[PDB]
Amino acid sequence: VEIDPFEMAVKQLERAAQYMDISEEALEWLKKPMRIVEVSVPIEMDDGSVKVFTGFRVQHNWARGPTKGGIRWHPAETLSTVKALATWMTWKVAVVDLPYGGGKGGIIVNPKELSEREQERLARAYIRAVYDVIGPWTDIPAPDVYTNPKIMGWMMDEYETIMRRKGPAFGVITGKPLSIGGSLGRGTATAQGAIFTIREAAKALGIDLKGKKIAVQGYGNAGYYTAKLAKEQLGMTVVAVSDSRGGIYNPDGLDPDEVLKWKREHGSVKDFPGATNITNEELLELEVDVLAPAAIEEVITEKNADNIKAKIVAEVANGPVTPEADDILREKGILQIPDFLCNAGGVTVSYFEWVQNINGYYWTEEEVREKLDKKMTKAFWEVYNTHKDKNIHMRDAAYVVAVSRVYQAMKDRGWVKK
Numbered sequence: 177v178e179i180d181p182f183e184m185a186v187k188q189l190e191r192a193a194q195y196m197d198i199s200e201e202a203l204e205w206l207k208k209p210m211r212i213v214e215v216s217v218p219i220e221m222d223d224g225s226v227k228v229f230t231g232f233r234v235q236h237n238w239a240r241g242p243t244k245g246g247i248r249w250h251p252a253e254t255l256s257t258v259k260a261l262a263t264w265m266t267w268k269v270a271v272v273d274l275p276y277g278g279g280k281g282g283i284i285v286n287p288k289e290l291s292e293r294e295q296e297r298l299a300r301a302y303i304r305a306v307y308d309v310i311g312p313w314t315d316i317p318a319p320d321v322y323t324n325p326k327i328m329g330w331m332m333d334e335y336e337t338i339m340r341r342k343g344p345a346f347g348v349i350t351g352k353p354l355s356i357g358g359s360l361g362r363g364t365a366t367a368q369g370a371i372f373t374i375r376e377a378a379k380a381l382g383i384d385l386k387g388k389k390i391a392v393q394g395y396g397n398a399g400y401y402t403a404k405l406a407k408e409q410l411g412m413t414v415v416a417v418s419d420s421r422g423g424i425y426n427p428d429g430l431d432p433d434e435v436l437k438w439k440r441e442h443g444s445v446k447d448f449p450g451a452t453n454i455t456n457e458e459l460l461e462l463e464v465d466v467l468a469p470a471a472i473e474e475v476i477t478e479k480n481a482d483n484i485k486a487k488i489v490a491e492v493a494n495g496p497v498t499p500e501a502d503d504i505l506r507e508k509g510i511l512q513i514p515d516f517l518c519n520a521g522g523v524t525v526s527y528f529e530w531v532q533n534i535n536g537y538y539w540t541e542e543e544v545r546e547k548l549d550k551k552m553t554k555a556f557w558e559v560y561n562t563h564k565d566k567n568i569h570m571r572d573a574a575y576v577v578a579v580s581r582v583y584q585a586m587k588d589r590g591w592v593k594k
């Protein structure tokens with residue numbers, strides 16, 4: 177009825193585990209986060225009053241290393257959502273082979289009504305509250321929904337103040353500004369990883385992307401950068417983009433820069449000059465070769481699953497395809513890139529930033545791009561090889577790979593004897 181996120185995550189995990197040989201005790205261990213921390217976050221309001229907010233910090237599993245995850249500042253943020261996202265982050269960092277665990281944070285707050293001073297106070301108070309469970313080798317937060325690198329810098333500064341500079345305080349948190357322990361290529365990380373996965377999928381299917389058409393659903397940061405990177409690196413034709421308000425259709429192709437400027441100047445991509453105006457519900461069914469949903473989740477359902485005509489569906493967003501839609505698309509012979517594999521570039525570049533901070537030596541744009549390319553190509557090819565060996569779904573193969581890595585790490589530590 178309410179479809180609790182944690183219940184759905186556990187159901188997904190059970191579905192995945194039924195496709196592989198895993199002990200019952202390890203599955204029961206994986207069904208529950210290893211540590212959940214709920215703290216009060218008191219800040220001083222600009223009018224002088226004191227308001228108390230609820231903060232979360234869930235560390236699902238740290239068998240493979242320190243936990244990794246973002247912090248969400250959303251008025252509708254709950255503990256269940258944080259737990260489910262930490263569980264998903266575990267598999268996200270496991271599939272792309274990072275020495276990380278699963279983690280997530282969140283504060284129930286509406287940041288649109290907070291001033292800059294109040295936002296800084298909130299970040300510093302959250303750090304002061306969760307200092308006891310975070311660290312460069314314990315738990316590394318990251319930017320997420322309604323959180324930017326500015327909050328990352330404030331949080332790192334507060335952590336460094338509390339820690340008294342006894343170690344790599346830069347590495348306690350990622351996504352920071354370039355002036356303070358930042359990393360090159362952070363802004364376009366997720367889209368770059370998605371482009372690498374799309375290129376590898378095209379390589380697997382034997383189709384060249386030069387001159388092909390791509391439709392991107394959702395024109396935020398991820399969607400815009402995905403369309404732009406596809407057009408430049410992959411040589412594809414950006415035929416259709418969209419946002420919440422509406423969508424754009426143009427057979428001759430769309431210039432992502434022009435569309436972004438129009439959206440910035442009018443608040444939406446609606447009524448772009450010399451272009452057909454459509455919505456998402458027909459955008460998802462346009463005849464394309466690559467479809468990249470980069471917007472609100474659950475856009476492909478059994479209603480529209482049979483009408484999808486894309487050869488490759490790159491799930492840039494977090495879970496935009498329902499399991500029934502997954503089965504329908506697999507029946508049609510459409511290669512799907514799993515949600516927590518396609519957008520694994522952001523966490524990979526976050527790991528690169530953490531490595532740079534820990535080592536004290538910082539890389540260049542080309543080095544980061546090449547390392548990200550290697551990691552994403554290897555992860556995608558491992559997932560596709562499992563998908564070809566086990567004759568299962570692509571999402572199922574990615575789950576098998578991630579859960580197998582986590583289970584092996586748990587067995588090596590002696591946490592589970594079977």
Ligand SMILES: N[C@@H](CCC(=O)O)C(=O)O
Nearest residue numbers: 244245246318522523526
């Ligand atoms: N939460 C973001 C940040 C990456 C990270 O966890 O380091 C993501 O999953 O992409």
